[PDB]
Design a protein around this ligand. Sequence first.
Ligand code: HEM
Ligand code: HEM
Ligand SMILES: CN(C)CCc1cc(F)c(F)c(CCc2cccc(N)n2)c1
Ligand SMILES: CN(C)CCc1cc(F)c(F)c(CCc2cccc(N)n2)c1
Ligand SMILES: C[C@H](O)[C@H](O)[C@H]1CNc2nc(N)[nH]c(=O)c2N1
Ligand SMILES: C[C@H](O)[C@H](O)[C@H]1CNc2nc(N)[nH]c(=O)c2N1
Ligand SMILES: [Zn+2]
Lengths: 416, 414
Amino acid sequence: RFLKVKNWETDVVLTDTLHLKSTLETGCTEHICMGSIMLPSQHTRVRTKDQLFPLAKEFLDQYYSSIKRFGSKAHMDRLEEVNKEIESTSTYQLKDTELIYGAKHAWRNASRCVGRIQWSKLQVFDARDCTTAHGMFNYICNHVKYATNKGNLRSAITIFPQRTDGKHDFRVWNSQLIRYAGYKQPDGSTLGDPANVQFTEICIQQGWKAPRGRFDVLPLLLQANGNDPELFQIPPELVLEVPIRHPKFDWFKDLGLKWYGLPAVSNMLLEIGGLEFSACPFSGWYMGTEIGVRDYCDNSRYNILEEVAKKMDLDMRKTSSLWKDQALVEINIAVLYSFQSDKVTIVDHHSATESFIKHMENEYRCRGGCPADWVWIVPPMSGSITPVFHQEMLNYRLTPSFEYQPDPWNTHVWKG
Amino acid sequence: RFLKVKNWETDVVLTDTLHLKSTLETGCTEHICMGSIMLPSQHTRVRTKDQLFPLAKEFLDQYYSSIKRFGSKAHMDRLEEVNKEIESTSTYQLKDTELIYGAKHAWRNASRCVGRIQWSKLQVFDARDCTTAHGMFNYICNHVKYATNKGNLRSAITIFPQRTDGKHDFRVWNSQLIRYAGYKQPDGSTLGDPANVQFTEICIQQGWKAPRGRFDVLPLLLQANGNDPELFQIPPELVLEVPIRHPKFDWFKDLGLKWYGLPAVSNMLLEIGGLEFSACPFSGWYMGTEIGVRDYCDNSRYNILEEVAKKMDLDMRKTSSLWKDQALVEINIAVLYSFQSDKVTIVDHHSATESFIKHMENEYRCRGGCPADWVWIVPPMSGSITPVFHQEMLNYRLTPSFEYQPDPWNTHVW
Ligand code: HEM
Ligand code: HEM
Ligand SMILES: CN(C)CCc1cc(F)c(F)c(CCc2cccc(N)n2)c1
Ligand SMILES: CN(C)CCc1cc(F)c(F)c(CCc2cccc(N)n2)c1
Ligand SMILES: C[C@H](O)[C@H](O)[C@H]1CNc2nc(N)[nH]c(=O)c2N1
Ligand SMILES: C[C@H](O)[C@H](O)[C@H]1CNc2nc(N)[nH]c(=O)c2N1
Ligand SMILES: [Zn+2]
């Protein structure tokens, strides 16, 4: 059974057979669509040998199909080897080749990711020999150095040991490797990034001396083998930052804004062949709107819309003057211009969405589909003047995958 | 099963139980979400004598509840009466009060409509006594004049006779009552509105003498009782139009842009108690972005971003200058400025989405929920700085409802 999607601006129609290979559930039913639910239980997140071998087998079948060795003796022997390792040891270990395939394909299957044209050019760092928080800090520093590359950013992921009994998890407690602190003041205002107030408090409680500034890089809070997490400060020379200025507005620099260069997600779960990798930080490079639209202008983040609109002297009485929309465009022009001027990799939302359309069409050609989440793919500004807005998309769940997981401070058992 | 929706800007959480009354189907499964498909089979649309009565019963049951007479003398009586009329005539006719209720609730249940906070204020015009296209034209003119109201716009729907056998359908062939024509030029490009090129040709291919301008109001093409349709010119004095100028850039009026004040969808199918109304033009008032973002700036429409940006002298050599975004804002400031200057009702996208959040809150409070289609409720510019962006929405299909329906010229035995 085949399915079609139409781009309504170009009348291009594509045929999806890949959704047939989909196992996991979406969250929708025939009588209700949950397409706009942010964290549906299905997309969030121990396994027993009962269900683990079929998950291994399906993954290995995929893997050996991709290398043109399906049904080969190398393929049959590996299946046998994994089987016996599961029955006697209860889990199994991926080879290096399988881990690299898995991480790439989890990104390939990331239906909310607009940057997936780059998916096969991913640098995979195997940190499965790591045993301690210090060991983790070392692997993460090397990730940040390699990925940053003096501004010429390179996609990378670092993979720490897989979950075993769920009581010895490796976790990076930060949501991203590099993020700014946020501080609730006694008068109710917030200093810094309001998204990080809760995590900032945990760090301070674990002993972090906070500078209490508006752009303080947070410490790494790292958990090895289920032990209590430990604080480490990324060396500042590894944290590339871009001061934000505007190409016409000389007064923009006086807002004292800066942002970091490397977007590196660190709280997600990597699932490959039934195995769960609970610490797997990954990084690419920023699309401009992530910083200029969401980070700076969300009412619940830095929320600089007013300060910018004031200095532009806009009619701020009625909303129908679109002063909000006007300040937003200027802030996003500044973010792009500051990054480009400093030769730090960044992509605008027009370029990135055009690329995704080309990626998606190619994926239908050579793979039979490309799972896509329209709600997340469409940029948070100027939606319809980007070609994804006019593109029908089918959302379904393939593995390997990145999944959400509960914040560790709500599940951790404290040693003391 | 008693589901929850969170707003992530405010942490407000609403519980939805209304969805458990949903009847029709979404197109999704638990294996694949179709939330971005524009027209699944379900959203498009005779009855056997059997499937008609359960539909009638469900509608009457919710009608009599809304008036607090569920399980009353009048309820069971009407129920029996509709039962008997169906056994005999194999259809039935709605009472005036039921027709009004059914129309307001088709709008109440339209999950892609952001303007639904106004749903109970709708003016319903019963046109079920109509028999000819000339009469149809008369009802539509009266609709237009009433809804326009000298620029103080008012919501209205006009309901033509319901389908009987499918051979005698009433249909308005225009997609909206008021739309601008579109002509294909000798040199490949398109003059006027490209969305209307086929329909603009059908009118000519029917007898319309086009002035071949850029903003030529289309004639009405009205089909009564399954007959061949007929052309009709809407009196100009009834078509309120707004010249578009900018409150800062005097060169903006030189661009020669105008738009019409009345958005009046005329090609949808209204379904009440299983009865199908194939001609039910309805109208409200515009949200600014429908014109300024989509109508003006869609690449497959008027596509004027190239010109506005040049006249703004912006660096159009790199997308990373965001010149499209910058021009897009100015256009949409102009549209709002022009309408508000000429005292024609219009709402900006910030106001409408704020009102929709308030409408959701009301519906969750007094009704138990509110079907909502995020892909359509979030405006096509400045998405995340409107409160609907951060709003989780549950999409499900309730009835009475508006459904899409095939274009008549593909169906009619001409
Ligand atoms: C190379 C440049 C990349 C760009 C421009 C990019 C862009 C984006 C954007 C804008 C989002 C939406 C997130 C939001 O708005 O909050 C997203 C989501 C996502 N990205 Fe990419 N990304 C890139 C690389 C990567 C890499 C290297 C990985 C993993 C190896 C990845 C995995 C994901 C995933 C899993 C999501 C979904 C998050 C969720 O389900 O909530 N991305 N990406
Ligand atoms: C009074 C002010 C109104 C406003 C501001 C408004 C706004 C909107 C907007 C912006 C859309 C998105 C469609 C698009 O972008 O093309 C929409 C869809 C819709 N509106 Fe409303 N509308 C109003 C009145 C009405 C009325 C009076 C009715 C019927 C009684 C109605 C029924 C609908 C329906 C059925 C749809 C969606 C069609 C579909 O399912 O694809 N609206 N509306
Ligand atoms: C709930 N909300 C905070 C989710 C934020 C979030 C969660 C994720 F898992 C995720 F991969 C991304 C994408 C961020 C990103 C990664 C790589 C490159 C890039 N340019 N951007 C963003
Ligand atoms: C995909 N597209 C071709 C569908 C067009 C379409 C179909 C509809 F039923 C519909 F109600 C509207 C909204 C137009 C409208 C109606 C009332 C007020 C307003 N401000 N605007 C637009
Ligand atoms: C409620 C809604 O699902 C939520 O606000 C989503 C909408 N789309 C998004 N799209 C992206 N890219 N990133 C986001 O964080 C969100 N948030
Ligand atoms: C492909 C996609 O479903 C299509 O572009 C939809 C998206 N959202 C929309 N939203 C509104 N309000 N109007 C539209 O026409 C559309 N088109
Ligand atoms: Zn769905």
